[PDB]
């Protein structure tokens, strides 16, 4: 799914050292000393648009050709990934 | 992930601009834009943007919740939240 159970060793328990220092800058407590990072230990892998792929049916000089475009999210640079033909109508 | 869109002004829009760029590699003599028809697909391209974790950890002996975010790209870590203490799990 999106959310995984990860093992509790060197790399989680980093995390946790991560926490309690970054904790310690804050001070909603006490100088906190780091002890250990217990199961279970949450993973959830964030999932982004990149951009955008199109197919297109698209007569050009009275052709039928198949074009593909790659349009970005956060610019909308586009550009042409292929374009053959002439093709056969749908 | 594949979806069929209409073919009003946006599309046509994207029709216009395969035909110009194909114009400037040339690989098919100038060709002049007619009209896209159906039916049209799109594609929605998604990428890994980060990761968010769950930690129970240990301080001074007192059991903590915390959730860090890490980034795909940069691997930068930030502290998002820090309650406790809270009852083991």
């Given at each position: 799914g999106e959310w995984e159970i990860i093992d509790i060793g060197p790399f989680t328990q980093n995390l946790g050292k991560f926490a309690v220092d970054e904790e310690n800058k804050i001070?909603?407590?006490?100088?906190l000393t780091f002890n250990k990072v217990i199961r279970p230990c949450m993973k959830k892998t964030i999932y982004e648009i990149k951009g955008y792929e199109y197919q297109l049916y698209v007569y050009a000089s009275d052709k039928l050709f198949r074009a593909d475009i790659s349009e970005d999210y956060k610019t909308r640079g586009r550009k042409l990934l292929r374009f053959n033909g002439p093709v056969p109508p749908p």
């Amino acid at each position: 799914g999106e959310w995984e159970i990860i093992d509790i060793g060197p790399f989680t328990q980093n995390l946790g050292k991560f926490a309690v220092d970054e904790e310690n800058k804050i001070g909603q407590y006490g100088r906190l000393t780091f002890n250990k990072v217990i199961r279970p230990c949450m993973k959830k892998t964030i999932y982004e648009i990149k951009g955008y792929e199109y197919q297109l049916y698209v007569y050009a000089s009275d052709k039928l050709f198949r074009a593909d475009i790659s349009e970005d999210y956060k610019t909308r640079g586009r550009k042409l990934l292929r374009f053959n033909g002439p093709v056969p109508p749908p």
